[PDB]
Amino acid sequence: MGLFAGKGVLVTGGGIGAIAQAFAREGALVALCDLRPEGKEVAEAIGGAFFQVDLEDERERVRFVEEAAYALGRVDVLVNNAAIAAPGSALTVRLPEWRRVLEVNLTAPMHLSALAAREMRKVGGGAIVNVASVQGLFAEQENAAYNASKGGLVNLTRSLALDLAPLRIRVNAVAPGAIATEAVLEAIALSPDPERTRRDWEDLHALRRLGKPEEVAEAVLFLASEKASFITGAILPVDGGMTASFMMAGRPV
Amino acid sequence: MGLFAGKGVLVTGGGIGAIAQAFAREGALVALCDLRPEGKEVAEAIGGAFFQVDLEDERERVRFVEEAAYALGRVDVLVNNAAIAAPGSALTVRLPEWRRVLEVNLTAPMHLSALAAREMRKVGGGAIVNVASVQGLFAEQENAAYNASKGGLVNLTRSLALDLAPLRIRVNAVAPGAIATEAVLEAIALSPDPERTRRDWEDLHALRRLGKPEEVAEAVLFLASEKASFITGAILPVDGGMTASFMMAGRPV
Amino acid sequence: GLFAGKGVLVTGGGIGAIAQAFAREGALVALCDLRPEGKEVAEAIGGAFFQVDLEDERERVRFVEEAAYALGRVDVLVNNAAIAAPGSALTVRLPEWRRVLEVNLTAPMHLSALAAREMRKVGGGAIVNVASVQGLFAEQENAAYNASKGGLVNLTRSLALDLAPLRIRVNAVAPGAIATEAVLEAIALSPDPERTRRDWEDLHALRRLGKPEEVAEAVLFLASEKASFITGAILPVDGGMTASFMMAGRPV
Amino acid sequence: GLFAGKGVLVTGGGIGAIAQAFAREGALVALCDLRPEGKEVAEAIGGAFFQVDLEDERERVRFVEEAAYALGRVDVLVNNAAIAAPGSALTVRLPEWRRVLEVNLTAPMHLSALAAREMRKVGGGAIVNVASVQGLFAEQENAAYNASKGGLVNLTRSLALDLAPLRIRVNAVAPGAIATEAVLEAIALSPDPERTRRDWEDLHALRRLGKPEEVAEAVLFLASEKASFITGAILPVDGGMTASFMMAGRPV
Ligand SMILES: Nc1ncnc2c1ncn2[C@@H]1O[C@H](CSCC[C@H](N)C(=O)O)[C@@H](O)[C@H]1O
Ligand SMILES: Nc1ncnc2c1ncn2[C@@H]1O[C@H](CSCC[C@H](N)C(=O)O)[C@@H](O)[C@H]1O
Ligand SMILES: Nc1ncnc2c1ncn2[C@@H]1O[C@H](CSCC[C@H](N)C(=O)O)[C@@H](O)[C@H]1O
Ligand SMILES: Nc1ncnc2c1ncn2[C@@H]1O[C@H](CSCC[C@H](N)C(=O)O)[C@@H](O)[C@H]1O
């Protein structure tokens, strides 16, 4: 019970659990969806609903919002957290994988925001938080689909903020750095030199450590709450100082 | 003769000949494409090739680069200038329109950059200039597809700059304000109060006038030239001061 | 509460929203202000007040030393004091310009360094600079403010990089038009108060002025361990103002 | 040329690239610099040289007055002089901090105003400030530079808004690491010159230092009528440095 007591919260990509747990801890009714079935454990662990959903599919996006709305009784908050990547520069990425990344990372958040918004009207407003990335504000080598899709999500965040202000819905984004999620910890483990990749990714931040999912969750939680009542259209880095430097924030040269 | 003497330049959406005439006057061999057949007049007027092309279609994009490359003998410069919009917020825009805007404004530049890049290798490098918009850096009400697609193009510009640097290809964007295109001039002319509409749009800029297409062309020209040899990944506003203010640059408080 | 037992310094705390917000979460608050009214704020919340001119480097040193002594510890510094010198570069006098830079830019740098040495004693802390959207963009005839605030924005980044090893996070909030007494008075002494209010409301997508309490919440969050992985960030608290390339609350 | 007959002022023109570039396009160039070697630049290009300390407001006034008189007209001002003071906010001395803010921030403001009064006489002109990527981002131990340059960036916006009605465009270039004699000297005085060079080259996607001539071209363009609808813009000349969230020329 507390800051989101009784409120209905939708989380796309809730399988990690940090975001879902954070809202649940504050008394929210959480509906999460994920492609991976493990998300069921997260929902059971927190007294929330789970839906196995492929956000690539527009019919499935409609079904998720409808069924989650029905399960929760209301929609107050949407968190768009699901994302994919297609490794490669524009030279090497295949068009189908590019279009899949745009569909999931950019088109799905737009669509879900519209669907969730129609529900939020019924309760007088709400908040949307899009989990972008520092990779929506800057790029890196060989990650074109991610960079383009996330860059679009950043300006989409602004679009939605302007358009949904009349419905009393705030829309913001968080732009995480390197976060110690299982995916990032496996990427490290599968890299040519895991030990050096760990040190190199820690050192992308001024704080010289990976971010924790809980730390992203707190930012999302804040932006979704009434504590952030005069904040809409904002893109908040949660990157331990990464984007404060023009080089490696945790290793100047 | 000139800064582009002998060089092969591709211009997407060149029906407004400003960009093509600018390159042509500096001695370029210009291949332009456009959906509208009027672009033929532009090509004839400047001694260049014209291709009627629908950039929405990936097969047509491949055919354009292949045939333009063959016609010109070389590719040195690509200018991605074609764009469309689908009026509406996320609440009102139809998914097919949204996907068509993303295809044309975001996917097409990515694809065309890759194709053009393989040609530029043959001549030891070159330059790409994407025409984004101030609407890729900020949003406005009821223009979600444009804002999202252009936002993506801005970060894609960065991605391409990083990835294409090793090929000695610079990639930049120009971000125009309100430009006196025939579409813009007509909207003014058909508005209930043309003098008010004009004054409002002029006053989005500190210079309190619409930009001319020729002014955008000069920015594109500069960024594509060796005069800009240490400039890559940059997004240059051509907006007479619009993005320098947090409100109307030409109409304070 | 979230700052129970912690020592919090607020420059320009005479308004009171920020001070009240930290106090409400159990903080020991030391505020300073040029205006003596800040005493009421401190009394109202069980905190210490110091009448201080932040323009003067000796007074800045004395404030941190005496506030540190009064509170027993320093965990948080909020740099909120600011002034302006109306005019473009053409009309602003150099002495006024230099006074605005001293107060808005130099004072925050200096105070951050002083506060930082005291935060080491308690294992870290947080600094929040109250910049403005006027540090990210400009407006006509406000050059000193725009320049000083622009500097504070990048100084926020500098401090974040340098103070990270000391476990001190440094962020800024960039408010839009806030219904402070200064702002409410400007409206009131306007030839058309209703029009001025409507125009400034409409700078924001939410089409209202921000409340000082709303800025306070942002400052509170950024100063707390809930922003543990947030440093070097500039957070707009501007109801969507900077999300548009024109008036966010009145498109054309 | 693009500046045939036009009067161009260049502050800290001693390096010479910018001066040469304008001269090559037919400009009458007046440059100033603290270092007497700018006389060789002025002699080499048929321009005037003034030995000037831009820290001093009286000297700034005298420069514009005398350069204006020598040239007959002022069309363009390029503010290129800058200094730095080593250290974070913890270690920088306040006197050194204030001197950087005076030369890097106050001097361009002042010089812009002075030059602007001259440009009115010929119906307008252009100002280009040489800021830095270090005005948009920071690095460790360079607080004065980061703050001053950050201020110059937003000042560039302020001036653009205020000087638009006078038909004067104001823009900035934001250079990366440029192979000036100071930068190369630092590489040489480094414990590992080869490593330092490789590191600084790799701050750019193009994986080399910029040349002063390359900055000059950007300045030249922004000052010309080819850039007629460009004002208030900040143009990186950084070979892709600010396009990445890490080292643009060395990803991890
Ligand atoms: N199409 C899809 N449908 C549902 N969940 C998806 C999904 N694509 C990815 N996810 C989930 O979303 C999470 C990945 S996103 C991870 C954080 C951040 N948004 C990022 O961009 O990296 C995982 O839990 C993953 O399984
Ligand atoms: N699919 C397509 N194929 C080819 N040309 C296209 C196109 N879609 C649009 N264009 C052309 O691109 C131009 C419009 S874009 C105009 C400039 C800027 N990109 C903007 O968005 O405002 C016109 O010449 C138009 O006919
Ligand atoms: N030199 C100085 N010393 C101490 N307090 C000062 C001061 N100059 C201004 N103040 C105080 O600082 C406060 C400014 S608060 C107003 C908002 C401000 N523009 C910002 O966003 O930072 C006021 O209470 C004022 O009286
Ligand atoms: N106070 C001053 N008066 C005049 N010239 C100065 C000066 N301080 C520095 N200069 C000169 O102006 C140039 C500045 S060197 C550094 C400039 C670079 N664009 C940067 O932003 O770091 C040099 O030629 C230097 O000798």
Side-chain angles (χ1 to χ4, degrees), chain A residues 12-16 33-36 53-56 81-84 104 131-132 146 150:
Chain A
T12 80
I16 310 137
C33 72
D34 208 292
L35 204 43
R36 303 186 289 103
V53 174
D54 187 0
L55 296 171
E56 191 183 341
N81 185 59
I84 59 168
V104 170
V131 183
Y146 195 75
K150 291 300 201 174

PDB file of all heavy atoms in Angstrom, chain A residues 12-16 33-36 53-56 81-84 104 131-132 146 150, ligand 1:
ATOM      1  N   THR A  12       5.234  -3.559 -19.642  1.00  0.00           N
ATOM      2  CA  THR A  12       5.636  -4.402 -20.784  1.00  0.00           C
ATOM      3  C   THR A  12       7.076  -4.803 -20.492  1.00  0.00           C
ATOM      4  O   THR A  12       7.802  -3.985 -19.954  1.00  0.00           O
ATOM      5  CB  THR A  12       5.396  -3.680 -22.123  1.00  0.00           C
ATOM      6  OG1 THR A  12       6.453  -2.761 -22.399  1.00  0.00           O
ATOM      7  CG2 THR A  12       4.068  -2.956 -22.170  1.00  0.00           C
ATOM      8  N   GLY A  13       7.442  -6.042 -20.784  1.00  0.00           N
ATOM      9  CA  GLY A  13       8.787  -6.501 -20.416  1.00  0.00           C
ATOM     10  C   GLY A  13       8.975  -6.505 -18.914  1.00  0.00           C
ATOM     11  O   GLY A  13       9.962  -5.915 -18.453  1.00  0.00           O
ATOM     12  N   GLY A  14       8.078  -7.166 -18.181  1.00  0.00           N
ATOM     13  CA  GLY A  14       8.152  -7.178 -16.714  1.00  0.00           C
ATOM     14  C   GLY A  14       8.849  -8.402 -16.175  1.00  0.00           C
ATOM     15  O   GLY A  14       8.864  -8.545 -14.949  1.00  0.00           O
ATOM     16  N   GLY A  15       9.426  -9.231 -17.048  1.00  0.00           N
ATOM     17  CA  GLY A  15      10.077 -10.494 -16.650  1.00  0.00           C
ATOM     18  C   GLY A  15      11.278 -10.301 -15.761  1.00  0.00           C
ATOM     19  O   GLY A  15      11.518 -11.185 -14.930  1.00  0.00           O
ATOM     20  N   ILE A  16      12.032  -9.219 -15.954  1.00  0.00           N
ATOM     21  CA  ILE A  16      13.154  -8.910 -15.027  1.00  0.00           C
ATOM     22  C   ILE A  16      12.539  -8.789 -13.636  1.00  0.00           C
ATOM     23  O   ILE A  16      13.032  -9.465 -12.720  1.00  0.00           O
ATOM     24  CB  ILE A  16      13.891  -7.642 -15.487  1.00  0.00           C
ATOM     25  CG1 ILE A  16      14.248  -7.713 -16.973  1.00  0.00           C
ATOM     26  CG2 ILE A  16      15.114  -7.374 -14.622  1.00  0.00           C
ATOM     27  CD1 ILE A  16      14.006  -6.428 -17.724  1.00  0.00           C
ATOM     28  N   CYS A  33       3.418  -8.173 -18.905  1.00  0.00           N
ATOM     29  CA  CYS A  33       3.484  -9.107 -20.010  1.00  0.00           C
ATOM     30  C   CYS A  33       4.922  -9.290 -20.430  1.00  0.00           C
ATOM     31  O   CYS A  33       5.763  -8.434 -20.185  1.00  0.00           O
ATOM     32  CB  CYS A  33       2.623  -8.648 -21.187  1.00  0.00           C
ATOM     33  SG  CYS A  33       3.261  -7.236 -22.117  1.00  0.00           S
ATOM     34  N   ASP A  34       5.187 -10.436 -21.053  1.00  0.00           N
ATOM     35  CA  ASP A  34       6.501 -10.772 -21.536  1.00  0.00           C
ATOM     36  C   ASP A  34       6.371 -11.933 -22.504  1.00  0.00           C
ATOM     37  O   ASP A  34       5.444 -12.709 -22.421  1.00  0.00           O
ATOM     38  CB  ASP A  34       7.419 -11.122 -20.355  1.00  0.00           C
ATOM     39  CG  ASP A  34       8.878 -10.835 -20.646  1.00  0.00           C
ATOM     40  OD1 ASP A  34       9.466 -11.524 -21.508  1.00  0.00           O
ATOM     41  OD2 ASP A  34       9.443  -9.920 -20.002  1.00  0.00           O
ATOM     42  N   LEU A  35       7.317 -12.023 -23.431  1.00  0.00           N
ATOM     43  CA  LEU A  35       7.415 -13.128 -24.372  1.00  0.00           C
ATOM     44  C   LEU A  35       7.821 -14.394 -23.617  1.00  0.00           C
ATOM     45  O   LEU A  35       7.298 -15.468 -23.876  1.00  0.00           O
ATOM     46  CB  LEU A  35       8.441 -12.784 -25.456  1.00  0.00           C
ATOM     47  CG  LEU A  35       8.346 -13.486 -26.813  1.00  0.00           C
ATOM     48  CD1 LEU A  35       6.924 -13.594 -27.350  1.00  0.00           C
ATOM     49  CD2 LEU A  35       9.192 -12.714 -27.808  1.00  0.00           C
ATOM     50  N   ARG A  36       8.736 -14.238 -22.654  1.00  0.00           N
ATOM     51  CA  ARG A  36       9.322 -15.341 -21.847  1.00  0.00           C
ATOM     52  C   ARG A  36       8.356 -15.730 -20.730  1.00  0.00           C
ATOM     53  O   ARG A  36       7.884 -14.866 -19.992  1.00  0.00           O
ATOM     54  CB  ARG A  36      10.673 -14.909 -21.267  1.00  0.00           C
ATOM     55  CG  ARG A  36      11.695 -14.464 -22.303  1.00  0.00           C
ATOM     56  CD  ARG A  36      13.056 -14.180 -21.688  1.00  0.00           C
ATOM     57  NE  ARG A  36      13.082 -12.972 -20.861  1.00  0.00           N
ATOM     58  CZ  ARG A  36      13.067 -12.931 -19.520  1.00  0.00           C
ATOM     59  NH1 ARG A  36      13.009 -14.045 -18.803  1.00  0.00           N
ATOM     60  NH2 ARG A  36      13.098 -11.762 -18.899  1.00  0.00           N
ATOM     61  N   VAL A  53       2.839 -12.488 -24.046  1.00  0.00           N
ATOM     62  CA  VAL A  53       2.443 -11.613 -25.152  1.00  0.00           C
ATOM     63  C   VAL A  53       3.620 -11.330 -26.059  1.00  0.00           C
ATOM     64  O   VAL A  53       4.729 -11.049 -25.573  1.00  0.00           O
ATOM     65  CB  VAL A  53       1.934 -10.235 -24.629  1.00  0.00           C
ATOM     66  CG1 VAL A  53       1.657  -9.287 -25.785  1.00  0.00           C
ATOM     67  CG2 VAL A  53       0.688 -10.391 -23.770  1.00  0.00           C
ATOM     68  N   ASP A  54       3.376 -11.372 -27.372  1.00  0.00           N
ATOM     69  CA  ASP A  54       4.347 -10.902 -28.339  1.00  0.00           C
ATOM     70  C   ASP A  54       3.950  -9.511 -28.825  1.00  0.00           C
ATOM     71  O   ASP A  54       3.048  -9.351 -29.652  1.00  0.00           O
ATOM     72  CB  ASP A  54       4.481 -11.859 -29.511  1.00  0.00           C
ATOM     73  CG  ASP A  54       5.602 -11.466 -30.437  1.00  0.00           C
ATOM     74  OD1 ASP A  54       6.287 -10.450 -30.165  1.00  0.00           O
ATOM     75  OD2 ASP A  54       5.809 -12.174 -31.437  1.00  0.00           O
ATOM     76  N   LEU A  55       4.665  -8.500 -28.323  1.00  0.00           N
ATOM     77  CA  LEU A  55       4.351  -7.105 -28.583  1.00  0.00           C
ATOM     78  C   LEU A  55       4.591  -6.697 -30.031  1.00  0.00           C
ATOM     79  O   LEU A  55       4.194  -5.608 -30.441  1.00  0.00           O
ATOM     80  CB  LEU A  55       5.160  -6.214 -27.644  1.00  0.00           C
ATOM     81  CG  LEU A  55       4.800  -6.426 -26.161  1.00  0.00           C
ATOM     82  CD1 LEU A  55       5.773  -5.688 -25.252  1.00  0.00           C
ATOM     83  CD2 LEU A  55       3.362  -6.002 -25.878  1.00  0.00           C
ATOM     84  N   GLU A  56       5.251  -7.569 -30.805  1.00  0.00           N
ATOM     85  CA  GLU A  56       5.413  -7.347 -32.230  1.00  0.00           C
ATOM     86  C   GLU A  56       4.072  -7.316 -32.964  1.00  0.00           C
ATOM     87  O   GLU A  56       3.932  -6.644 -33.985  1.00  0.00           O
ATOM     88  CB  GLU A  56       6.310  -8.405 -32.852  1.00  0.00           C
ATOM     89  CG  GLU A  56       6.697  -8.028 -34.278  1.00  0.00           C
ATOM     90  CD  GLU A  56       7.521  -9.069 -34.986  1.00  0.00           C
ATOM     91  OE1 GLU A  56       8.131  -9.956 -34.328  1.00  0.00           O
ATOM     92  OE2 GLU A  56       7.584  -8.970 -36.223  1.00  0.00           O
ATOM     93  N   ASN A  81       8.551  -1.103 -21.365  1.00  0.00           N
ATOM     94  CA  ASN A  81       9.912  -1.533 -21.085  1.00  0.00           C
ATOM     95  C   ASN A  81      10.489  -2.600 -22.012  1.00  0.00           C
ATOM     96  O   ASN A  81      11.670  -2.861 -21.969  1.00  0.00           O
ATOM     97  CB  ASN A  81      10.017  -1.987 -19.642  1.00  0.00           C
ATOM     98  CG  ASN A  81      11.433  -2.323 -19.261  1.00  0.00           C
ATOM     99  OD1 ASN A  81      12.321  -1.488 -19.339  1.00  0.00           O
ATOM    100  ND2 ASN A  81      11.657  -3.563 -18.871  1.00  0.00           N
ATOM    101  N   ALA A  82       9.652  -3.208 -22.849  1.00  0.00           N
ATOM    102  CA  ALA A  82      10.102  -4.266 -23.747  1.00  0.00           C
ATOM    103  C   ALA A  82      10.940  -3.659 -24.867  1.00  0.00           C
ATOM    104  O   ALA A  82      10.566  -2.654 -25.444  1.00  0.00           O
ATOM    105  CB  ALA A  82       8.918  -5.029 -24.344  1.00  0.00           C
ATOM    106  N   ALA A  83      12.074  -4.292 -25.171  1.00  0.00           N
ATOM    107  CA  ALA A  83      12.898  -3.879 -26.281  1.00  0.00           C
ATOM    108  C   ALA A  83      13.701  -5.053 -26.822  1.00  0.00           C
ATOM    109  O   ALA A  83      13.987  -6.009 -26.108  1.00  0.00           O
ATOM    110  CB  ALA A  83      13.817  -2.761 -25.853  1.00  0.00           C
ATOM    111  N   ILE A  84      14.058  -4.960 -28.103  1.00  0.00           N
ATOM    112  CA  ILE A  84      14.954  -5.891 -28.744  1.00  0.00           C
ATOM    113  C   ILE A  84      15.975  -5.106 -29.543  1.00  0.00           C
ATOM    114  O   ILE A  84      15.872  -3.880 -29.673  1.00  0.00           O
ATOM    115  CB  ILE A  84      14.196  -6.901 -29.629  1.00  0.00           C
ATOM    116  CG1 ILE A  84      13.392  -6.174 -30.732  1.00  0.00           C
ATOM    117  CG2 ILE A  84      13.309  -7.776 -28.755  1.00  0.00           C
ATOM    118  CD1 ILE A  84      12.840  -7.081 -31.826  1.00  0.00           C
ATOM    119  N   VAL A 104       8.729  -3.370 -32.468  1.00  0.00           N
ATOM    120  CA  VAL A 104       8.710  -3.649 -31.031  1.00  0.00           C
ATOM    121  C   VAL A 104       9.089  -2.438 -30.184  1.00  0.00           C
ATOM    122  O   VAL A 104       8.418  -2.144 -29.222  1.00  0.00           O
ATOM    123  CB  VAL A 104       9.576  -4.890 -30.680  1.00  0.00           C
ATOM    124  CG1 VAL A 104       9.752  -5.043 -29.168  1.00  0.00           C
ATOM    125  CG2 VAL A 104       8.947  -6.154 -31.281  1.00  0.00           C
ATOM    126  N   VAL A 131      10.795   3.386 -21.210  1.00  0.00           N
ATOM    127  CA  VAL A 131      12.190   3.079 -20.935  1.00  0.00           C
ATOM    128  C   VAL A 131      12.900   3.119 -22.284  1.00  0.00           C
ATOM    129  O   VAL A 131      12.767   2.217 -23.100  1.00  0.00           O
ATOM    130  CB  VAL A 131      12.357   1.732 -20.206  1.00  0.00           C
ATOM    131  CG1 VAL A 131      13.825   1.490 -19.868  1.00  0.00           C
ATOM    132  CG2 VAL A 131      11.503   1.721 -18.933  1.00  0.00           C
ATOM    133  N   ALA A 132      13.597   4.230 -22.541  1.00  0.00           N
ATOM    134  CA  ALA A 132      14.382   4.394 -23.743  1.00  0.00           C
ATOM    135  C   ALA A 132      15.770   3.825 -23.392  1.00  0.00           C
ATOM    136  O   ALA A 132      15.878   2.670 -22.951  1.00  0.00           O
ATOM    137  CB  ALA A 132      14.412   5.861 -24.165  1.00  0.00           C
ATOM    138  N   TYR A 146      18.568  -0.486 -32.958  1.00  0.00           N
ATOM    139  CA  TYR A 146      18.363  -0.054 -31.556  1.00  0.00           C
ATOM    140  C   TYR A 146      18.459   1.475 -31.473  1.00  0.00           C
ATOM    141  O   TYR A 146      17.547   2.097 -30.895  1.00  0.00           O
ATOM    142  CB  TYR A 146      19.385  -0.721 -30.642  1.00  0.00           C
ATOM    143  CG  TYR A 146      19.062  -0.648 -29.173  1.00  0.00           C
ATOM    144  CD1 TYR A 146      18.083  -1.447 -28.618  1.00  0.00           C
ATOM    145  CD2 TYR A 146      19.759   0.211 -28.331  1.00  0.00           C
ATOM    146  CE1 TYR A 146      17.801  -1.397 -27.264  1.00  0.00           C
ATOM    147  CE2 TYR A 146      19.493   0.264 -26.973  1.00  0.00           C
ATOM    148  CZ  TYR A 146      18.515  -0.545 -26.432  1.00  0.00           C
ATOM    149  OH  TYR A 146      18.260  -0.473 -25.087  1.00  0.00           O
ATOM    150  N   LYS A 150      15.175   3.624 -30.639  1.00  0.00           N
ATOM    151  CA  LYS A 150      15.221   4.350 -29.371  1.00  0.00           C
ATOM    152  C   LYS A 150      15.232   5.882 -29.524  1.00  0.00           C
ATOM    153  O   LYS A 150      14.639   6.591 -28.707  1.00  0.00           O
ATOM    154  CB  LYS A 150      16.420   3.916 -28.531  1.00  0.00           C
ATOM    155  CG  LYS A 150      16.317   2.499 -27.992  1.00  0.00           C
ATOM    156  CD  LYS A 150      15.106   2.295 -27.103  1.00  0.00           C
ATOM    157  CE  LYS A 150      15.344   1.089 -26.215  1.00  0.00           C
ATOM    158  NZ  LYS A 150      14.263   0.925 -25.214  1.00  0.00           N
TER     159      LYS A 150
HETATM  160  N1  LIG E   1       7.942  -8.594 -28.120  1.00  0.00           N
HETATM  161  C1  LIG E   1       8.059  -8.675 -26.798  1.00  0.00           C
HETATM  162  N2  LIG E   1       6.964  -8.991 -26.072  1.00  0.00           N
HETATM  163  C2  LIG E   1       7.084  -9.072 -24.743  1.00  0.00           C
HETATM  164  N3  LIG E   1       8.159  -8.903 -23.982  1.00  0.00           N
HETATM  165  C3  LIG E   1       9.233  -8.595 -24.725  1.00  0.00           C
HETATM  166  C4  LIG E   1       9.262  -8.464 -26.100  1.00  0.00           C
HETATM  167  N4  LIG E   1      10.539  -8.134 -26.523  1.00  0.00           N
HETATM  168  C5  LIG E   1      11.239  -8.072 -25.421  1.00  0.00           C
HETATM  169  N5  LIG E   1      10.512  -8.338 -24.288  1.00  0.00           N
HETATM  170  C6  LIG E   1      11.009  -8.366 -22.913  1.00  0.00           C
HETATM  171  O1  LIG E   1      11.426  -7.069 -22.541  1.00  0.00           O
HETATM  172  C7  LIG E   1      12.679  -7.134 -21.813  1.00  0.00           C
HETATM  173  C8  LIG E   1      13.818  -6.555 -22.653  1.00  0.00           C
HETATM  174  S1  LIG E   1      13.952  -4.758 -22.619  1.00  0.00           S
HETATM  175  C9  LIG E   1      15.253  -4.446 -21.423  1.00  0.00           C
HETATM  176  C10 LIG E   1      15.409  -2.953 -20.911  1.00  0.00           C
HETATM  177  C11 LIG E   1      15.434  -1.806 -21.959  1.00  0.00           C
HETATM  178  N6  LIG E   1      14.045  -1.378 -22.363  1.00  0.00           N
HETATM  179  C12 LIG E   1      16.207  -2.165 -23.240  1.00  0.00           C
HETATM  180  O2  LIG E   1      15.857  -1.562 -24.241  1.00  0.00           O
HETATM  181  O3  LIG E   1      17.154  -2.958 -23.197  1.00  0.00           O
HETATM  182  C13 LIG E   1      12.833  -8.624 -21.446  1.00  0.00           C
HETATM  183  O4  LIG E   1      12.170  -9.032 -20.249  1.00  0.00           O
HETATM  184  C14 LIG E   1      12.230  -9.274 -22.706  1.00  0.00           C
HETATM  185  O5  LIG E   1      11.926 -10.652 -22.609  1.00  0.00           O
END
